[PDB]
Amino acid sequence: RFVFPEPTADVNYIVMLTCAVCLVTYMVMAAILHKLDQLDASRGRRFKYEILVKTGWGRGSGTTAHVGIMLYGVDSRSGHRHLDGDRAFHRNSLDIFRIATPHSLGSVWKIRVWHDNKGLSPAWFLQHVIVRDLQTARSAFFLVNDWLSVETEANGGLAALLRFRRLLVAELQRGFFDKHIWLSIWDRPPRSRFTRIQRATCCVLLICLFLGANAVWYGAVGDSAYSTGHVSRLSPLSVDTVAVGLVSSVVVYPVYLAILFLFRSLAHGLSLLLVAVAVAVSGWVGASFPPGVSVAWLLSSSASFLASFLGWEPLKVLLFLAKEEARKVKRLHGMLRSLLVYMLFLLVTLLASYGDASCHGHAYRLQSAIKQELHSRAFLAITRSEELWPWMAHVLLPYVHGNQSSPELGPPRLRQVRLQEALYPDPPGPRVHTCSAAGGFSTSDYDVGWESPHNGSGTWAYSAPDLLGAWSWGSCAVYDSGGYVQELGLSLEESRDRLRFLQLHNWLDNRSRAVFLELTRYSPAVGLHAAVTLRLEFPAAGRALAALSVRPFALRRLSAGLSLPLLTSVCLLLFAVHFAVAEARTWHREGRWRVLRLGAWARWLLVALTAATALVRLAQLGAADRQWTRFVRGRPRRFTSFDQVAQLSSAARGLAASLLFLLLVKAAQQLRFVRQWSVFGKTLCRALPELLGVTLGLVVLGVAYAQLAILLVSSCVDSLWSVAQALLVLCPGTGLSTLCPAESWHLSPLLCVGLWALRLWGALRLGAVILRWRYHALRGELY
């Protein structure tokens, strides 16, 4: 019933990323927990008011011992205590004094106090440790003066009471969260041998065991019905995903129980080896996973963890400095919960971005091949509007009907824009035209040749633009999806006849705003589609400039079911809503005048980025589904372009990359919590205006020098004079168009600025002059 997995596929990143994230968060949480434990290992071992908290009238009703008081409340309780002074627990001593106990209980009848039976049974008559109102009045001044048996827990409110209605209910708040290990890493009471690191090891052991067992069950057990594709769909059937996680948790429960009972040493190494081998097994089995069973494995692991957290552990239990230590431990707990939330967000983002990194290598080779077998050089090097037809008749046509790899998936199309405003040739001039002479765009219908409507509508109709998918963008303007269309034919022989008919019937010479040839390709070996777009723009009659775009993408459809992109998108929406509501609450707690300081501007950016990523991914899925449904209906009748899907996929990938970059930067700046490593970032914050001033001065100096150079260079042709001597201090060889060509100079001047900063990088060393000084000041005061 067990099958050795085969070395199929190449590799799976989902399981590896999940295991790496779990190990990293475990290591960071272990570091934090050790920092807290060493703080509360040797040390740390409104309820109190100004009422008579002692009763010293007893005669022979005391002994040298201690006492304790346990109370419950709304997510708050108390514990034992031991205090003494100079009287050394005098007989019936009236000690009306309270220490900074953690007894943050409420105004409820939940309290039980008892002393130590040092010697014989004491029948002392002590009223109570009365407390009425000091800061919040969490108790009531109601003393009963009731006595119990020897060291027996005296009843109280706000000597043989041994019944399961009360004896067992004591553990409902005493050992409740002391053993619910998942929600107990920050509930460790003193006088216990837990160390708060054994809990972390047990938790990471449980997580790794769940992951490994689920990976084994999906990737090795396939002898019943192969447990894949037949009925175990990736979509939740409600009887398979839970039915494997619950069973996995039940089977793996005893090995965790053994280690827990051993703890309750050398078990650290045993648990480390066990989690290491489990992770290795999960990674080895991970290679044999199609995406559907991969998301099924993710959901099964989540279900098993939830079942362990909520189903088994709750039923497992049924078998000077003091005013700042509390603040520091509260800060540590906040750090822990924020770290857990951030690691969950980082895992979701990593799965959203690098979910399919195998196609990222194949897409590059596919687009390179499509360019090299389309003769991109021969297309980008055409300027007139009469070599288009020979280029198509010689290159493209043998590529469409030329049966080879990368099948066609739909006939090509040629759509033209008329502009109705026939252009005039211009004098040679410096060219570099922005083709602004365009006016309106033609919309009427025309017959064969051009305008001559005899009977009804023209044979060359406008074919009004589609609502979704347009705006190729270009030098002249931003186009759309409309234009006069020609289908170029189906067979190779008739295609040549159509091409020559368009040649000799006055089609492209006169008006011709654009040509807009477009294609699509399919690669089933890697399962990738490709959108190919070829465009020639005619700024003036007899002149053209070329553009080529090959966009490889993957056709992910919304109707496919519970895809990984869908899950990542819904998780990102949930995270964005959580961040937005938290920020809105915190902002409302301060009202107006919060727009000051970057603190409130780093949250809106994150929320907007997350929302944009999720919405763009959802839009891409919907557009892909709509386009596929449109295309499937009739193949040899329509083009059904896929450019919008490619653009949406590119935008979603860019947004995910930007979000991951921001998360990595945030992780980088959270390294300050080491005492000696907190200086660095601090200096970067304390020396910022100096860097701004240096940058402004350098920009002004560069502007002055650039003006000097531009005025000097544009004088005449080579004469070997002093002007070129002074201008030769830059741009390699007494002038190289400021090191970026003029055609590239009127294209994103920020890039040229960056290039010139890179070339003259010795000026930036001036910044060091500032930074060093600051580092000598900030570091000199911490000591």
């Binding site: 010795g762 060393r765 001036l766 060091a768 002059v769 500032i770 060093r772 000084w773």
Partner: peptide
């Protein structure tokens, strides 16, 4: 080329110290 930076850094330190000591009593 690393000796211009020494002069500039030293002058910056001297100027900062002079300004800090002048501001203390004013």
């Amino acid at each position: 080329l690393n000796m211009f930076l020494a002069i500039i850094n030293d002058t910056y330190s001297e100027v900062k110290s002079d300004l800090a000591q002048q501001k203390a009593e004013m």
